Amino acid sequence: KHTGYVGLKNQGATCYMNSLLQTLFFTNQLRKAVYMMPTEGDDSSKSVPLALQRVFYELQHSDKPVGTKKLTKSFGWETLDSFMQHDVQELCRVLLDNVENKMKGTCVEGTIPKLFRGKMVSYIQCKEVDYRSDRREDYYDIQLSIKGKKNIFESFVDYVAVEQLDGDNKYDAGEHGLQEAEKGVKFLTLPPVLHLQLMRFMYDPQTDQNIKINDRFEFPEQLPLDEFLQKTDPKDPANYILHAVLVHSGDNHGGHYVVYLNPKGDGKWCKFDDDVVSRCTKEEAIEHNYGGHDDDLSVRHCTNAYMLVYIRESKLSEVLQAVTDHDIPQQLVERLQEEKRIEAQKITDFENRRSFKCIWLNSQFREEEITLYPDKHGCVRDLLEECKKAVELGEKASGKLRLLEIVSYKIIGVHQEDELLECLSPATSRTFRIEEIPLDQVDIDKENEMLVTVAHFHKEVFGTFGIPFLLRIHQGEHFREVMKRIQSLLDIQEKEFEKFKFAIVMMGRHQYINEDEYEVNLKDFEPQPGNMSHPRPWLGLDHFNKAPKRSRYTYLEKAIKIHN
């Protein structure tokens, strides 16, 4: 792609799942472990680990967005669950538990706890009695309180902060009955991968319902955590690097999820939005998700980070160790490869398509507006072939079409049939045109001939108009034959044709050509020694137009005068 990696198709309301899947996919140590699960006798319909192996495989190998269709099916979900909106952290707690239990009795058993499990202590001291209780518990994430705190530092301070067990929450000391007590929590272990859940919700008594907290909350790029451990370590400080930011836009029980990541661990961030991966800047992943912007109000107001993923500075290499195909077992690569081959067999139930509006140039060399419906994840050949059964094909003709990118009424390049439709420019300046290749341009002679771009202009080279077209020019040909071809391509009146002028155009500078010197030489239509992503020189036609017009603007116009 433009970034190295690819995204995941949305089935309807599976953005939380796509986000969390990308988060786990770049936990390379976990991916390597999932690849090694025993799924050789497992049924595709009922194997969560095997479905996970498929999604990971395709995300590594494919360059077109990946479907998660079988993944929800292995969960035991009907298609009605594919439109459910869910919490990404809830899906995390369920999926990781399910897989940890399924890894039990295998060779990578205990992988999830080695990466995500930590330990904490709950100390309890009674205020009026000599009674001190002690409890050690495990955890896989941390629920940090948000409201009233300025950044992560203050929220960890408040988590380990001593709380009061008073009034209705007196401590059951058993022997001394309910006693007033003090409860404190300290950290003993911080795992290699740290999942923090920002408690972005509270009860609003004004509306008697739960509400998303969209206030400002800062999370640092580098995370110092030796302050909050019970016993520290001068040989291995709990220093963490931000690895992922799971952003939630929207309401308490509705909205849309997105995920930001620097997969390599280096600082080169990119955004994962369902089936679109796109590079971005560090400021868009961090600062712009502190959020708590209540001004100029649009989506931004309820768009903010929800789940943070940090990685220990000393563990960055083992967690993000590279993954080749020598990490992937043979029977999985061949299970999935020989699994796709059963699909070249199989009109109904297609698909998350897009509308594509473009111009269709006909055999009579005139324009028709046409709108097609190709697969958003399809290629240009799909669009061309989708055109062929939506138009007349000419009685007999080349039967092969081509796609042109036109900006400012000039053809600025032909698109190869391989180009994915996603990588076409959505800019307003671009207009795409599908036309049928003429007979002399199908299999053209390379040494002597070339296809050059022709466009109309009027006394200024940047004042272009009309319909550009591709023209075949032969080496050493006498120019009167080229004019003979061009005339047979416009088909207006003979009288307007002698008024024409012809010129070579490069970078705004232009040189007119002699119509009677007959000098056609391919060297005159080639760029500067080195340049090709530099504008191709082109042939321009100078003459007068037939054009559409627009209203008269008055309502008080024109002039300017100072009477005194």
Binding site: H86, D87, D97, Y139, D172, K183, M199, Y257
Partner: protein, 76 residues
């Protein structure tokens, strides 16, 4: 037996429960004490989200164990 729940304000509350209590019963006691509708509460213990239909003894939740209460940000 008395367990702890960390609430949505990060405060610890107590709950008097029995090992044979189901998760729904525990959520009902949390509703009685904190006001949160059972259908929006989620309880996390030792990284596993506690599942409706099972009991505290299934999870080895004991006196002085702490459960973490959270609610949802849905998206799709």
């Amino acid at each position: 037996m008395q367990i702890f729940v960390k609430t949505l304000t990060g405060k610890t509350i107590t709950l008097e429960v029995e090992p044979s209590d189901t998760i729904e019963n525990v959520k009902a006691k949390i509703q009685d004490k904190e006001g949160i509708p059972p259908d929006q509460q989620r309880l996390i213990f030792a990284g596993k989200q506690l599942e409706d239909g099972r009991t505290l003894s299934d999870y080895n939740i004991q006196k002085e164990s702490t459960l973490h209460l959270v609610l949802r940000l849905r998206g799709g």
